[PDB]
């Protein structure tokens, strides 16, 4: 009951105007103004929104804030793809005297195209050889959606041994990156004589290799 | 227009205290206007407010201390107004405790308005010791990539740069997989082209912050 709530999903179009509740009760919203807060991935939370209405000098003009009774509610006019982010709400609390939140809100802007993921492969280097390990890693960059395989093959000899492959995160621009470790022994690396790293989208795979020589 | 930094020592123990400092680089830590204040958040989670302090409450209004209650057993916080900096310790640290911990300027009015915000320290609960990494150079149509690969480490994170930072147009720097090994790894690439490769020199520059560690490696092939 001394306690904000928000909707954990919100979505749309670029152009569009997309509105973001916030609820609470009379010892919080009720009694207080409300300030909101939008955070981009790997970064900080910004003042978006204060005192319920009023914007922070950089805050473009579309963001706009309303309350009324114990809800208020963010509202992003002409949807761009920047916006795609967490937004948070924040007020205060007579009962508990103190700062409390909502538990967010997803805004995902979607339309947005499909992008091919651009591909880097590298092999060990003449130090993590000469000191007795071997790793291979794979860089895959700049796709939307965040969904794709790394299959590794040793001729075609398909390897799947120490593979650490991460999970794709959610890059600046809003498309995705992830990247594949093989790893293995030294001697296991000038054994075989090429390895590949092939890594699917949609239904379009990609492929580079490269060998030792 | 002020500034905020965090620091601290990255990696606590369980049941430990953690500690950390905000330093205030762009004004004087003094206003009768603004509280100081920390704010958290575990991985994937949401925001959670800690507690906030004035600064200064002489003769005019007070030294108003606020606390989330959840914590207020756990938690102290402090100003050394001569150091331009306030403080942050939290008691008797579980795992459910590890978050990017903020520094916030609060406004005394509009129920808190958090307008300025430091970049955020990450802060690992964990028994395990700390491990420095191991940077391995990578060496390589029209574009050229190029890179390091910064090799077990343990906890997050590590930043990496470029020639003392000089170089940042064309670098990217890829989140880290969590290996079997309870270990990080993470690699650096910058894409330029030619004709170049032979003339410029290609340092990364690699801090691991959590085991006080810093470490150049120049490329090239062998």
């Known amino acids: 009951q001394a306690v904000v709530t928000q909707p954990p999903s919100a979505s749309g179009t670029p152009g569009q105007r997309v509105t973001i509740s916030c609820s609470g009760s009379?010892?919080?919203?009720?009694?207080?103004?409300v300030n909101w807060y939008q955070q981009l991935p790997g970064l900080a939370p910004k003042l978006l929104i204060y005192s319920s209405n009023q914007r922070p000098s950089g805050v473009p003009d579309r963001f706009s804030g309303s309350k009324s009774g114990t809800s208020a509610s963010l509202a992003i006019s002409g949807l761009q793809s920047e916006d795609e982010a967490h937004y948070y709400c924040?007020?205060?609390?007579?009962?508990?005297?103190?700062?409390?939140f909502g538990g967010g809100t997803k805004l995902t802007v979607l339309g947005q195209p499909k992008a091919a993921p651009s591909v880097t492969l590298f092999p060990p280097s003449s130090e993590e050889l000469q000191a007795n390990k071997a790793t291979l890693v794979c860089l895959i960059s700049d796709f939307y959606p965040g969904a794709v395989t790394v299959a590794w093959k040793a001729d075609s000899s398909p390897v799947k041994a120490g593979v650490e492959t991460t999970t794709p995160s959610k890059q600046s621009n809003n498309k995705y990156a992830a990247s594949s470790y093989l790893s293995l022994t030294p001697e296991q690396w000038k054994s075989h004589r090429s390895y590949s790293c092939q890594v699917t989208h949609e239904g379009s795979t990609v492929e580079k290799t490269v060998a030792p020589t | 227009q002020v500034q905020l930094q965090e620091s601290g020592p990255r990696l606590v123990k369980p049941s430990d205290t953690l500690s950390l400092t905000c330093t205030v680089s762009?004004?004087?830590?003094?206003?009768?206007?603004?509280?100081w204040g920390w704010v958290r958040q575990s991985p994937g989670k949401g925001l959670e407010w800690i507690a906030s302090?004035?600064?200064?409450?002489?003769?005019?209004?007070?030294?108003?201390?606020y606390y989330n209650p959840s914590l207020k057993s756990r938690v102290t916080i402090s100003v050394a107004t001569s150091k331009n900096q306030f403080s942050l310790k939290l008691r008797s640290v579980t795992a459910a405790d590890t978050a990017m911990y903020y520094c916030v300027r609060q406004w005394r009015y509009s129920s808190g308005s958090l307008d300025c915000w430091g970049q955020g320290i990450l802060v690992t609960v964990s028994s395990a010791s700390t491990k420095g990494p191991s940077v391995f150079p990578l060496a390589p149509g029209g574009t050229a990539a190029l890179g390091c690969l910064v090799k077990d480490y343990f906890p997050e994170p590590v930043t990496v740069s470029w020639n003392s930072g000089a170089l940042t147009s064309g670098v990217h720097t890829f989140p880290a997989v969590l290996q079997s090994s309870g270990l990080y790894s993470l690699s650096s690439v910058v894409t330029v082209p030619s004709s170049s490769l032979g003339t410029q020199t290609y340092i990364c520059n690699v801090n691991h912050k959590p085991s006080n560690t810093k470490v150049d490696k120049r490329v090239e092939p062998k």
């Open positions: 009379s010892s919080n919203i009720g009694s207080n103004t």
């Open positions: 924040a007020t205060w609390d007579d009962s508990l005297n103190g700062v409390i």
């Open positions: 762009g004004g004087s830590i003094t206003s009768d206007s603004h509280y």
């Open positions: 302090t004035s600064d200064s409450g002489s003769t005019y209004h007070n030294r108003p201390i």
